């Protein structure tokens, strides 16, 4: 039952939550993907400060 | 220190690496003791112990 | 710096299959011919359905997809019909399509087997293979008392690359070098392998000696047709199709050489 | 959602050329024939027919991606000859071979039916 | 002429350590005109060789009978006079090692030239008087012909 | 190369013998051999080089008490030397035109160009001398005048290129400012933790032991000592 | 739930073979001999006739 | 800090290179003047990259030190490695 | 554009081949390409003119000059190592050992002329000899990939 059509997901300036003006959760709500802490740690290692800033501030909840 | 195990080390990381008179490295196979407890201040202060 | 002079020797010809042998040709030409038999030989098949009523246990897409796989006699009609893309009509005209019809209702208590016989076409030349005057009729769907299936289908001209329903072959047994003389394969235990039907060796032997100056020749074939096109018509339509593709490519080529300046 | 149309493998899209010829700058007397809406069916026969021409130093074909339906054929010839000329003769030769094979097949079929 | 070595060898053994590959075999040969031991790997599939056979070996830096360097490229459209026509087995490789018995002060009396024909290895060892033209990173040929 | 060999092999392999004229006549050209035999200043420089390598030999003995010469360093000298051999078509059978004094002077100038610490004060010079120490040792032991004369047989152009290569590859191996070496280390230590297994005497290994180390525990699961004996007790079993 | 039209591997028609196949089995034929009498030589078509389950016959037990 | 004696490394770090190409690409995207030739370069990234290889980027990198001081190193004074 | 250039210069796949965790490449050859490269670089692999032209067509770093085959008569035949030499870039140099390399070979004779085609030796960007495997193309340290990077 694990097909790709039921798993494919994309988002670009979609809806956001009410409490925090951040993207929703889930394909059903056109939610965004979670740029978790482990990802932050990875980009910290890359020294990519602009990417880490764009992902945690400009692409999530400016 | 409940128990102590005596054995000859087969690996060179526990053997005694000396420098022979010719200048070559020699790994001496010497007896060593492994304890089940930890008391360094008292074990180190013993005769015949390195 | 020129072409070869291939020959042919047919060892079996029936209404279902044809077994022939091609000699003095390159392996590429033999393989491309094999590929054309499956993917570039035009044939007529259902490609448009309009379900007017369907009370059966099988949904509409299930019936449409079934109907597409029914082989239709296309020996002399496929060369006359045209593709819907090039045809200058609309809808589904008689020059680019063949209209079909089905109207079945189970009134009796016994299960009604909707078969290909019930597919009524406007052209008597394009009809289901099983309906051609043994073999039984293809089964589309079974109906219970009170159920109905009524539709209006259209057949089109297509080839295998667009959909497998447009494949006139039911298996193409392509073989070359039965005795492994060219050593294209390396049997770790040649004694454990069986002998091909085209092999010419004593049972005491497993494979022929290696031939360093050898080249692939004497390609064997077995074109089993689904029934739509006679086994020989598939080969002729294949060679004509591949020759047309090369002719068109040569035309576009000359147009590009000339366009240079 | 993304199943590409089946006719997209063989029908040429509006404004897309069937064949493009690009001169190779690495070595002299070499060209690349980028043919659209084709596969190994033509690439192999053209490759093999080009290898038989002694004036052809290199003849190969490749598919940049199986999902795409294009093909690239590289041809290198001697200075006195030309790759476009080799590709043209190779097509002409294949046409003659298939024409001959077709007539000999019709003859074989007639001989087999009459017995 | 472009010939670096030429002699007649006699196959003394074939695959002493056992058959490792199927289409390749290691030949242990020895000559008679110069007494040079030889270890060679050939393609027995297209050029079978039996124990006790005798062949003529000619290590040359070029195939042209006249002195002319090669371009290292495959050009079958070459009608120049080539010495490969007088031979049956021909290979193309490069020298990758030249060993010897030289010491800190004395020169080399015996040498051992190693060549690799695209993986097919060859070791020709003997007296240094016969191995002066061999130099590492140099393209050479084989020109092997079996005789009775 | 200067860690494991014996004193005899170390002298026979690294001390430049400027006495045997026949050997030099085989390794060096005619202009260079007469200069090495006649000039005395060069013989003193080569002796000083050998002495410096003997001091470094003892420095390695105190650094690596175990016979483990496998070390991690920025630039691989054996591959660079091989690359120079192939780039300039060096013939190992012909005599070399590389003067050994140019080898010694070149290595000293290169050692001065590799600057991990910038400053002429004695504190910076001491830190620089200690940072590039292991590399300068592997460099002086690999780029030795003897090895460059009977083993590698490089020419003047190949040596000049080798120095420029070592300088560039080393300056490229220096850590870049701003590198978040912290997270880089935590990730480098956490990645293998996912592949290792949780599980004479029983000893704790894997994640439980890595855990007890990162979170210093006053009650480990398998605490143990490694007692070593001094004299006869180390050899016989009765006193042990 | 009903016998396919073509064999998924080769493309041979099998839709007209199911009723005939059942008609042979009731006639005391073995599954192998029945598949041979229908002209199914390749193991791909034999797979189609020997591994099929006529589920439609159970779906028709329910009123429409 | 005395510019006559700059203790930082003379090479440009991978991070300095990244930020230089990024900011210069942004400038070019905002129709800023170009310093080098543009034979077939439009994508601001390729333009900033050719400008780096040419060493004609008008940017100064202010390398901050832990003590609080800073050293202003121009893109022309730094040695590009990659 | 800043972030685009930043990722293009700090996080791209080419620049991430070697890792500081263990100073060795993390990405290497994989399942089919590693079993086939093993069976391709063997001593008994000979390619005809048609097959070679088919393979060389898939090389991006090819100058367009076909190399003189390792066997010119009685039939022109190229070897797998002769094509892999074209695959290897520049003029790198490497020495490795195949998984089946015996320990009693580097001591006795035939050390430089291996019977089992072990003792991988790349010189001037040409696979002089040896069978490639994970020890020469995998994620190990000092492999042909690590040296290429
Ligand atoms: Zn129409
Ligand atoms: Zn089938």
Tab-separated table of C-alpha atoms and ligand atoms in Angstrom, chain G residues 7 9-12 42 44-45, ligand 2:
chain	number	residue	atom	x	y	z
G	7	UNK	CA	-0.539	-13.124	-20.473
G	9	UNK	CA	4.750	-11.789	-19.790
G	10	UNK	CA	4.316	-12.743	-23.467
G	11	UNK	CA	0.927	-11.386	-24.482
G	12	UNK	CA	-0.828	-14.603	-25.486
G	42	UNK	CA	5.507	-21.476	-22.083
G	44	UNK	CA	4.228	-17.876	-18.295
G	45	UNK	CA	0.816	-18.657	-19.786
J	2	LIG	ZN1	2.510	-16.131	-21.707
